[PDB]
Amino acid sequence: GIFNTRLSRTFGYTIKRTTVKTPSWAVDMMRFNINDFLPPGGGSNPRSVPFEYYRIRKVKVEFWPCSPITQGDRGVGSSAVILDDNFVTKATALTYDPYVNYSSRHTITQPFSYHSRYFTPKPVLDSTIDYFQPNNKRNQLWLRLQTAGNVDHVGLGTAFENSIYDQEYNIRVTMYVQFREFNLKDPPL
Amino acid sequence: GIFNTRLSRTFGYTIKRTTVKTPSWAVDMMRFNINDFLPPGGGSNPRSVPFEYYRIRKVKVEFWPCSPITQGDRGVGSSAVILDDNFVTKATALTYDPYVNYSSRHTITQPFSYHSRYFTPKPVLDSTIDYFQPNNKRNQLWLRLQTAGNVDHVGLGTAFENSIYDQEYNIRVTMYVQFREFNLKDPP
Amino acid sequence: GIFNTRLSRTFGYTIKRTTVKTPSWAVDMMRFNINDFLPPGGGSNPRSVPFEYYRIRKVKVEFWPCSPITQGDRGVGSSAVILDDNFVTKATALTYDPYVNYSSRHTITQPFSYHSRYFTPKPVLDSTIDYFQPNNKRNQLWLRLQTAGNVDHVGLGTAFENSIYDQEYNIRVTMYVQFREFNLKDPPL
Amino acid sequence: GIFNTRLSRTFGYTIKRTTVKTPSWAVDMMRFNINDFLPPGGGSNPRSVPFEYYRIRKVKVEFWPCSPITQGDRGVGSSAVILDDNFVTKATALTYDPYVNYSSRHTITQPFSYHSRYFTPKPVLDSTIDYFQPNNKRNQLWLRLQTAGNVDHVGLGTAFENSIYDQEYNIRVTMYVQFREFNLKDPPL
Amino acid sequence: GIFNTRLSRTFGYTIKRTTVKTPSWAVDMMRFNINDFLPPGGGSNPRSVPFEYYRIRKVKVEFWPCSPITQGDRGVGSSAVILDDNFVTKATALTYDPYVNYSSRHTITQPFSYHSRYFTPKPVLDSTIDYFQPNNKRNQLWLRLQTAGNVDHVGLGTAFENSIYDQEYNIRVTMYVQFREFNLKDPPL
Amino acid sequence: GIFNTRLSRTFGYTIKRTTVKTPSWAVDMMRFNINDFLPPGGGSNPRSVPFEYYRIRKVKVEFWPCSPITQGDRGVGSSAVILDDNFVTKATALTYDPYVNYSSRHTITQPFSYHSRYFTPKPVLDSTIDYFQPNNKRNQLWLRLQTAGNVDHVGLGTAFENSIYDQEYNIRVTMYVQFREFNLKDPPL
Ligand SMILES: O=C(O)[C@@H]1O[C@@H](O[C@H]2[C@H](O)[C@@H](NS(=O)(=O)O)[C@@H](O)O[C@@H]2COS(=O)(=O)O)[C@H](OS(=O)(=O)O)[C@@H](O)[C@@H]1O[C@H]1O[C@H](COS(=O)(=O)O)[C@@H](O)[C@H](O)[C@H]1NS(=O)(=O)O
């Protein structure tokens, strides 16, 4: 019983100002979990979408700027796809862009420019070995939609060039999911 | 955001014995409401299934017997589709079968036999005037999925020949619905 | 169980004389109900036609004159189709023909001339909103054939030019109906 | 104004037990009249189906058993079509099956078995001469739908083998009729 | 007597400022009635467009901004189509965008960006059951053009992200309507 | 914004009796103005049909008789088309039919006979020079729909033969007009 749908979530991210003169970059990570998109249900149905299995097909991360188009001290960054839960260490002012030479690098124009990334994440099945599957719609694993313990999906790391002014963003993540085995429970009343 | 699916429910129905000698029948109706099939949800989502709209396509009533095959005093009855919520009056022992001559009559063997009906019900918009639409998948209306006030649908009435023994059935209903407008809400 | 048939009914209508010199018109309305065409039945069958549902397909209103061909002070009127239960107010001597500029106006030659109107009426489902369906034989609503409370169908308004002489008519309404679900009940005797 | 429809009626028939050891048969007859299927009407319409003429096209006699499938002392009988109102005399325990060598004989398995007969009856126009028409849909006579004096149609006789146990049946007769000349009368009220 | 035309109306909407730091959204509703587009007439014609029936085909809601392109604290919202008169409750600062996961969601870039929505509304025939028709130009119901009591059409709800600055808009609604049965009345003078 | 419609108006005309023995004719004129067909509107819309420009395409003058078919002293007259506002002088009993030799003459049988004339009128732009355009649907001038000062259109003159009895008529003029530039005004309320 397949049901392809779309789940979204919005949150903020700010790159604080720095008095540093050099071009330094701010590094951060981004994971994706389905608990943040799918709330708990009620009653005999533990989740709000009554299905048993799921598998995330795609994610769309949108960096919607919060800064005016008149803001100066512009910069240039990079967003890369990291499917293994080993990101570059979080840094405030690093002397280089680590994600620049990555094959999945897209340039981030800053601060007042929109940046989208559309990709297929991978689940963290074993963080010790960090193995994942290649892209195959027919062979992608089905995970279970747990009650409160779903596994973290992974796949984006960023590097933003710091500035004299604060750079704020409203980040909207949209997960395109595919459920299976409609499992609604209908007790009496 | 269409989503076809299937919902079901189970309950019992019995026909108490009668010392009457003549062939008499017992009458009873049957309504259909979605609140019985779809429990309430939790939190911001009032219903377990997050959509706004629905419109019933079909219903499948299943009279599963509870009796053995060796039971005697066999009889015969009838069921018919009634799309107005104005049925024949409920009765214990009536001297004729009202539902026999209706064009939508399907015979009912008794007591140990399976019986099924597969049709399109209709809603009750105005019980005074009792109007509805002909069968059309494209022009069917879209109803709202209320919080605790959904409308009763209709479409079946029955007539069972009485007997010396108690006739018990397990009734399974199955609905084929079609939702729209995925309306999930994700608070922090 | 479809059964298309034809039901008729006959009644009178008179436009009384007036001493008024001007050309004035007499306005009146005309509704259609199935109780006036279908009598009550007997016994377990509440109606004389043993069916459950109905829907009126067409109506033929015939103004059969009662006046001789030698009658003078002739006039000219109008009949229009009003599918919403909001007619022009009934008037005895109105200074104009209200139904003249209606798109459904047919001229009524008076007094000794035959006038027919053949159209599809509409039921009064909500008199507050006054909504109706367009003409579609396949999508027309089925109403219930009630016992003594059927709903009024609507669709004709008239305007007759007054005269020094009385203008009488014998009006024959014929409804072309379509029933469904033969529901005869046969108790013993 | 033709209207083909279907009228039904249900009643009981029992073959009482006998201590007789031999195989004996119980003989009985079955006539069909339209008064038992069509009740009287009400008012100016004397009958509930408002038509003038009729002619019975077919009849379906269904012997629905009332006995369990575990009942013993089973037997074998015969049902024949008798279109002339001269049946074998009614008998309780006759030493043979009279309807066995009839060209229209169908075997009746007893007691817990269903038996249907579908045929075209004939009316009793003259019981002295007992004449009837062959099967012709185009030339079949139209009778009048009388008020309380319709003529008996004929066409089935049976022979059931007796048993130590009582053999009950619920007999459902269905007549497929064809009416003509819709004659509804609509007085005022 | 069909006459397709276009009726417009302009009004304001402001999202007041908030000292709240989080990303919160301001929720509001939008209904459409023909009294706000069609004024009352004069004399025997109760309305200014002399027709009897109407049905709204489409509506175009245009959010024309009032804010300069230099305004900061930009945001992102959502507009959805709600054809049933049960909107998300009006809120000043809600912690999420309710209309984000709706199938009819269009993103609203704020504050200095134009947003249009072009759709087919539905009338509020029964607010208790809240039933409506699918899109069909041939089967769409005709309503009556009442004098002062027309029924509210429905179909848009919004969610605007709040800001430190006031966000003003000039909203221009354009209804594309279709009238029927020209009913002009011409008394003497 | 073109809208072709049809506007009507009804009024009386009587040819009084004369004791004169000779065959004499009664001459009269007939002009057409849109104020008599289109009433004043209400509010910001000065007219009831909300358009700016107009041009009359055709007019249908219908002489509907008021006299019985048994009336004697019958006669014969003439109706001609006069597109220039210079009619034959109005006369009570003229010794000849002036409109008889006109190229646009149609015979009027009197008194109990119907007479129609269907033609294209012309406006009175300059009564001193009396110039008009030939018939051309594509080149016909657009006039303005004034508030209370529209220009008179012209195009029919008649000659009725007098009689011992009074000859009454109900004259129904129907103008087929074509408007342009829908100009509805919708203030608030
Ligand atoms: O007691 C609760 O309500 C807990 O709900 C869930 O935690 C939510 C919290 O409910 C929610 N607020 S709400 O408006 O009350 O819904 C918001 O605070 O987020 C928190 C954290 O959610 S997150 O998904 O962890 O981010 C948890 O349940 S669930 O989301 O896993 O379903 C859990 O912490 C609580 O629910 C459990 O307890 C309920 C009450 O009974 S008892 O007193 O705990 O025995 C029980 O009925 C629930 O079934 C149970 N949740 S289960 O699904 O894990 O069984």
mmCIF file of N, CA and C in Angstrom, chain F residues 59-108:
data_model
loop_
_atom_site.group_PDB
_atom_site.id
_atom_site.type_symbol
_atom_site.label_atom_id
_atom_site.label_comp_id
_atom_site.label_asym_id
_atom_site.label_seq_id
_atom_site.Cartn_x
_atom_site.Cartn_y
_atom_site.Cartn_z
ATOM 1 N N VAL F 59 -34.371 47.709 -35.929
ATOM 2 C CA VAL F 59 -35.605 47.945 -35.195
ATOM 3 C C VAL F 59 -36.697 47.123 -35.853
ATOM 4 N N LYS F 60 -37.575 46.577 -35.021
ATOM 5 C CA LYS F 60 -38.749 45.829 -35.446
ATOM 6 C C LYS F 60 -39.965 46.532 -34.876
ATOM 7 N N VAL F 61 -40.715 47.179 -35.746
ATOM 8 C CA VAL F 61 -41.984 47.789 -35.387
ATOM 9 C C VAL F 61 -43.093 46.819 -35.742
ATOM 10 N N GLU F 62 -43.915 46.487 -34.754
ATOM 11 C CA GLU F 62 -45.004 45.533 -34.902
ATOM 12 C C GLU F 62 -46.298 46.254 -34.576
ATOM 13 N N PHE F 63 -47.188 46.333 -35.554
ATOM 14 C CA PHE F 63 -48.541 46.837 -35.351
ATOM 15 C C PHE F 63 -49.425 45.653 -35.014
ATOM 16 N N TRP F 64 -49.661 45.464 -33.730
ATOM 17 C CA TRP F 64 -50.551 44.416 -33.273
ATOM 18 C C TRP F 64 -51.969 44.963 -33.218
ATOM 19 N N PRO F 65 -52.917 44.417 -33.974
ATOM 20 C CA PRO F 65 -54.249 45.008 -33.989
ATOM 21 C C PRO F 65 -54.994 44.807 -32.687
ATOM 22 N N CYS F 66 -55.945 45.705 -32.474
ATOM 23 C CA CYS F 66 -56.852 45.660 -31.348
ATOM 24 C C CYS F 66 -58.290 45.421 -31.767
ATOM 25 N N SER F 67 -58.547 45.249 -33.048
ATOM 26 C CA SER F 67 -59.870 45.232 -33.617
ATOM 27 C C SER F 67 -60.263 43.812 -33.996
ATOM 28 N N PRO F 68 -61.547 43.477 -33.939
ATOM 29 C CA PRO F 68 -61.960 42.118 -34.260
ATOM 30 C C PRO F 68 -61.877 41.837 -35.745
ATOM 31 N N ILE F 69 -61.844 40.546 -36.068
ATOM 32 C CA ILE F 69 -61.808 40.137 -37.463
ATOM 33 C C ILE F 69 -63.142 40.305 -38.169
ATOM 34 N N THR F 70 -64.197 40.666 -37.446
ATOM 35 C CA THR F 70 -65.498 40.942 -38.027
ATOM 36 C C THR F 70 -65.696 42.405 -38.388
ATOM 37 N N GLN F 71 -64.704 43.257 -38.158
ATOM 38 C CA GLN F 71 -64.872 44.680 -38.395
ATOM 39 C C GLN F 71 -64.825 44.953 -39.888
ATOM 40 N N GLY F 72 -65.768 45.757 -40.354
ATOM 41 C CA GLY F 72 -65.867 46.116 -41.741
ATOM 42 C C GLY F 72 -65.245 47.459 -42.048
ATOM 43 N N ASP F 73 -65.590 47.982 -43.222
ATOM 44 C CA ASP F 73 -65.021 49.222 -43.732
ATOM 45 C C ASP F 73 -63.505 49.119 -43.785
ATOM 46 N N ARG F 74 -63.026 47.979 -44.257
ATOM 47 C CA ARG F 74 -61.608 47.724 -44.332
ATOM 48 C C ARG F 74 -60.939 48.684 -45.306
ATOM 49 N N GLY F 75 -59.616 48.722 -45.230
ATOM 50 C CA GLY F 75 -58.839 49.671 -45.983
ATOM 51 C C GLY F 75 -57.465 49.169 -46.328
ATOM 52 N N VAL F 76 -56.657 50.041 -46.915
ATOM 53 C CA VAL F 76 -55.320 49.675 -47.355
ATOM 54 C C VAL F 76 -54.426 50.897 -47.235
ATOM 55 N N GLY F 77 -53.293 50.715 -46.564
ATOM 56 C CA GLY F 77 -52.358 51.780 -46.288
ATOM 57 C C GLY F 77 -50.947 51.437 -46.682
ATOM 58 N N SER F 78 -49.998 52.187 -46.140
ATOM 59 C CA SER F 78 -48.610 52.055 -46.535
ATOM 60 C C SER F 78 -47.710 52.501 -45.397
ATOM 61 N N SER F 79 -46.614 51.772 -45.214
ATOM 62 C CA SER F 79 -45.563 52.120 -44.272
ATOM 63 C C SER F 79 -44.248 52.216 -45.022
ATOM 64 N N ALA F 80 -43.539 53.322 -44.827
ATOM 65 C CA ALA F 80 -42.285 53.581 -45.504
ATOM 66 C C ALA F 80 -41.211 53.948 -44.497
ATOM 67 N N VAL F 81 -39.966 53.822 -44.939
ATOM 68 C CA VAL F 81 -38.788 54.031 -44.112
ATOM 69 C C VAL F 81 -38.185 55.381 -44.466
ATOM 70 N N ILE F 82 -38.099 56.261 -43.473
ATOM 71 C CA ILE F 82 -37.733 57.662 -43.659
ATOM 72 C C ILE F 82 -36.573 57.957 -42.723
ATOM 73 N N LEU F 83 -35.362 57.948 -43.261
ATOM 74 C CA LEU F 83 -34.147 57.985 -42.465
ATOM 75 C C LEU F 83 -33.567 59.383 -42.292
ATOM 76 N N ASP F 84 -34.391 60.444 -42.325
ATOM 77 C CA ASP F 84 -33.859 61.801 -42.378
ATOM 78 C C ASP F 84 -34.630 62.857 -41.599
ATOM 79 N N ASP F 85 -35.681 62.503 -40.871
ATOM 80 C CA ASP F 85 -36.375 63.441 -39.996
ATOM 81 C C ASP F 85 -37.123 64.511 -40.774
ATOM 82 N N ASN F 86 -37.526 64.205 -42.006
ATOM 83 C CA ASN F 86 -38.422 65.059 -42.774
ATOM 84 C C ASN F 86 -39.509 64.137 -43.302
ATOM 85 N N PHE F 87 -40.565 64.027 -42.513
ATOM 86 C CA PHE F 87 -41.720 63.218 -42.818
ATOM 87 C C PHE F 87 -42.746 64.035 -43.581
ATOM 88 N N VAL F 88 -43.667 63.327 -44.229
ATOM 89 C CA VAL F 88 -44.868 63.972 -44.726
ATOM 90 C C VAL F 88 -45.611 64.544 -43.538
ATOM 91 N N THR F 89 -46.179 65.728 -43.724
ATOM 92 C CA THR F 89 -46.834 66.426 -42.634
ATOM 93 C C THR F 89 -47.968 65.586 -42.069
ATOM 94 N N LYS F 90 -48.108 65.622 -40.751
ATOM 95 C CA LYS F 90 -49.172 64.889 -40.089
ATOM 96 C C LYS F 90 -50.525 65.411 -40.542
ATOM 97 N N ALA F 91 -51.384 64.490 -40.962
ATOM 98 C CA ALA F 91 -52.683 64.810 -41.513
ATOM 99 C C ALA F 91 -53.722 63.865 -40.939
ATOM 100 N N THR F 92 -54.943 64.375 -40.812
ATOM 101 C CA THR F 92 -56.067 63.598 -40.318
ATOM 102 C C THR F 92 -56.790 62.883 -41.451
ATOM 103 N N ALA F 93 -57.132 63.608 -42.514
ATOM 104 C CA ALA F 93 -57.818 63.038 -43.670
ATOM 105 C C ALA F 93 -57.214 63.662 -44.923
ATOM 106 N N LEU F 94 -56.164 63.035 -45.431
ATOM 107 C CA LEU F 94 -55.526 63.438 -46.672
ATOM 108 C C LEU F 94 -56.094 62.629 -47.828
ATOM 109 N N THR F 95 -56.252 63.280 -48.972
ATOM 110 C CA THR F 95 -56.953 62.710 -50.115
ATOM 111 C C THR F 95 -56.144 61.676 -50.880
ATOM 112 N N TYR F 96 -54.985 61.268 -50.387
ATOM 113 C CA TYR F 96 -54.163 60.293 -51.081
ATOM 114 C C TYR F 96 -53.198 59.680 -50.082
ATOM 115 N N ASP F 97 -52.576 58.584 -50.498
ATOM 116 C CA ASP F 97 -51.564 57.900 -49.712
ATOM 117 C C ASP F 97 -50.197 58.403 -50.144
ATOM 118 N N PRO F 98 -49.513 59.229 -49.349
ATOM 119 C CA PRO F 98 -48.240 59.765 -49.827
ATOM 120 C C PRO F 98 -47.140 58.736 -49.902
ATOM 121 N N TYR F 99 -47.164 57.741 -49.027
ATOM 122 C CA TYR F 99 -46.106 56.755 -48.932
ATOM 123 C C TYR F 99 -46.313 55.575 -49.869
ATOM 124 N N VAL F 100 -47.182 55.708 -50.865
ATOM 125 C CA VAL F 100 -47.549 54.565 -51.690
ATOM 126 C C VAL F 100 -46.490 54.294 -52.746
ATOM 127 N N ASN F 101 -45.935 55.338 -53.345
ATOM 128 C CA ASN F 101 -44.951 55.184 -54.400
ATOM 129 C C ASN F 101 -43.530 55.126 -53.874
ATOM 130 N N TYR F 102 -43.348 55.111 -52.561
ATOM 131 C CA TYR F 102 -42.021 54.993 -51.992
ATOM 132 C C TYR F 102 -41.445 53.612 -52.241
ATOM 133 N N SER F 103 -40.142 53.578 -52.489
ATOM 134 C CA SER F 103 -39.452 52.327 -52.742
ATOM 135 C C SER F 103 -39.469 51.396 -51.544
ATOM 136 N N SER F 104 -39.647 51.932 -50.340
ATOM 137 C CA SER F 104 -39.708 51.151 -49.116
ATOM 138 C C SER F 104 -41.125 50.959 -48.617
ATOM 139 N N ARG F 105 -42.109 51.055 -49.497
ATOM 140 C CA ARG F 105 -43.491 50.910 -49.095
ATOM 141 C C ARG F 105 -43.833 49.444 -48.929
ATOM 142 N N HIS F 106 -44.462 49.131 -47.803
ATOM 143 C CA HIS F 106 -45.128 47.866 -47.576
ATOM 144 C C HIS F 106 -46.594 48.175 -47.351
ATOM 145 N N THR F 107 -47.455 47.352 -47.924
ATOM 146 C CA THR F 107 -48.885 47.540 -47.781
ATOM 147 C C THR F 107 -49.340 47.179 -46.381
ATOM 148 N N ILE F 108 -50.191 48.028 -45.824
ATOM 149 C CA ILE F 108 -50.845 47.787 -44.547
ATOM 150 C C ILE F 108 -52.279 47.408 -44.874
#
